[PDB]
Amino acid sequence: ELKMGELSELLGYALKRAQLRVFEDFLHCVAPVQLTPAQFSVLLLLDANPGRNQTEIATTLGILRPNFVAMLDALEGRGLCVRTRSPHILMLTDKGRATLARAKKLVATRHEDRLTELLGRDNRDALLSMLATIAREF
Amino acid sequence: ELKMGELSELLGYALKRAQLRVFEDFLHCVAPVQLTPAQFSVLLLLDANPGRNQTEIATTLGILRPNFVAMLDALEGRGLCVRTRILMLTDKGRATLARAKKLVATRHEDRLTELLGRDNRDALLSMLATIAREF
Ligand SMILES: CC(C)(COP(=O)(O)OP(=O)(O)OC[C@H]1O[C@@H](n2cnc3c(N)ncnc32)[C@H](O)[C@@H]1OP(=O)(O)O)[C@@H](O)C(=O)NCCC(=O)NCCSC(=O)/C=C/c1ccc(O)cc1
Numbered sequence A: 001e002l003k004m005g006e007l008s009e010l011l012g013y014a015l016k017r018a019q020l021r022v023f024e025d026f027l028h029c030v031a032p033v034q035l036t037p038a039q040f041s042v043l044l045l046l047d048a049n050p051g052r053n054q055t056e057i058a059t060t061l062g063i064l065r066p067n068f069v070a071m072l073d074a075l076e077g078r079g080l081c082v083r084t085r086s087p088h089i090l091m092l093t094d095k096g097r098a099t100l101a102r103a104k105k106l107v108a109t110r111h112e113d114r115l116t117e118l119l120g121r122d123n124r125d126a127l128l129s130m131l132a133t134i135a136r137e138f
Numbered sequence B: 001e002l003k004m005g006e007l008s009e010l011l012g013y014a015l016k017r018a019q020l021r022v023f024e025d026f027l028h029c030v031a032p033v034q035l036t037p038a039q040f041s042v043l044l045l046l047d048a049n050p051g052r053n054q055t056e057i058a059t060t061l062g063i064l065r066p067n068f069v070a071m072l073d074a075l076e077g078r079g080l081c082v083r084t085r086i087l088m089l090t091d092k093g094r095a096t097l098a099r100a101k102k103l104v105a106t107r108h109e110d111r112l113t114e115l116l117g118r119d120n121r122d123a124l125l126s127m128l129a130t131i132a133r134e135f
């Protein structure tokens, strides 16, 4: 299937392929603490925004209800966060906080730094901006 | 949640959010012919590379084998392609592909390009291709 036709001129294709490659690298770099990007993002949102419910987290990360529930089942079964009553709030446990701190360090040092070096600082920044604009306005 | 911490400065996160929004718009625009992005891309590669096999289509698209087998069962069951002793587009496949390509270019990709600069769009395309190729 060597000829790409219009695929190699379509932004969505290139976006998807880049997204896939970055995920695969994330997974390898963060493997010592066994997080997917979404797992990492959730823990990271929980630690930065305590006392939020399961809906605020899922909606902020564009994850659908039954998908979010399944992912909470995994995180909670691993002892990384807890579901706990609202006067359905979510809290990191100590184990959560510890795996998160380690993950942040692997992500920055091992994964993000290499992507920035590949791209260069100006490109990286213009890329991040254009991506943010697609997400926000497209 | 509202504080985004490091998420808002991480490349992969922005990449994923951008990808999601683009896929969602694609689905909306190509909806008269009922194709996901990967379905379109499989039909397109088959059309452009007649006589190549399952495994080469899948590996060029970065699709694993059992996922690929499942997507061919759907495409074959819709009468869009046939497994024959290799993969072949049917006439109905070629007709839906042609229609799709138009909807993609006119309603979807054109709008994306207009949002960004024409120049910013070309540079985005090229940076994404670099990530896919080299990272
Ligand atoms: C490509 C696959 C084989 C099919 O994707 P799809 O055509 O969008 O099909 P679906 O989204 O309907 O279903 C995929 C699976 O996710 C499942 N799924 C559904 N929602 C749920 C749920 N809420 N909970 C859990 N499971 C669920 C779904 O049921 C299904 O599993 P299964 O039913 O067991 O076969 C996909 O599953 C996959 O393996 N992706 C990983 C690799 C990959 O994406 N490679 C790139 C392919 S090429 C490409 O994306 C092109 C993009 C493009 C973009 C823009 C353009 O202009 C041009 C091109």
Ligand SMILES: CC(C)(COP(=O)(O)OP(=O)(O)OC[C@H]1O[C@@H](n2cnc3c(N)ncnc32)[C@H](O)[C@@H]1OP(=O)(O)O)[C@@H](O)C(=O)NCCC(=O)NCCSC(=O)/C=C/c1ccc(O)cc1
Pocket (backbone or CB within 6 Å): A026, A036, A037, A038, A039, A040, A041, A061, A062, A063, A064, A067, A068, A070, A071, A107, B007, B010, B011, B012, B013, B016, B067
């Ligand atoms: C976020 C979910 C809920 C969980 O993803 P995951 O943590 O990677 O976990 P899994 O890969 O183990 O997927 C769990 C289930 O989804 C299935 N799935 C799902 N897409 C498929 C498929 N294309 N084919 C085949 N099976 C599938 C998958 O097989 C499985 O189903 P099941 O076996 O029945 O429990 C995901 O499934 C989902 O619902 N939607 C994708 C929407 C979404 O990505 N929103 C953004 C979340 S935030 C984010 O991604 C951040 C990235 C980031 C990047 C870099 C950074 O530095 C920082 C952050």
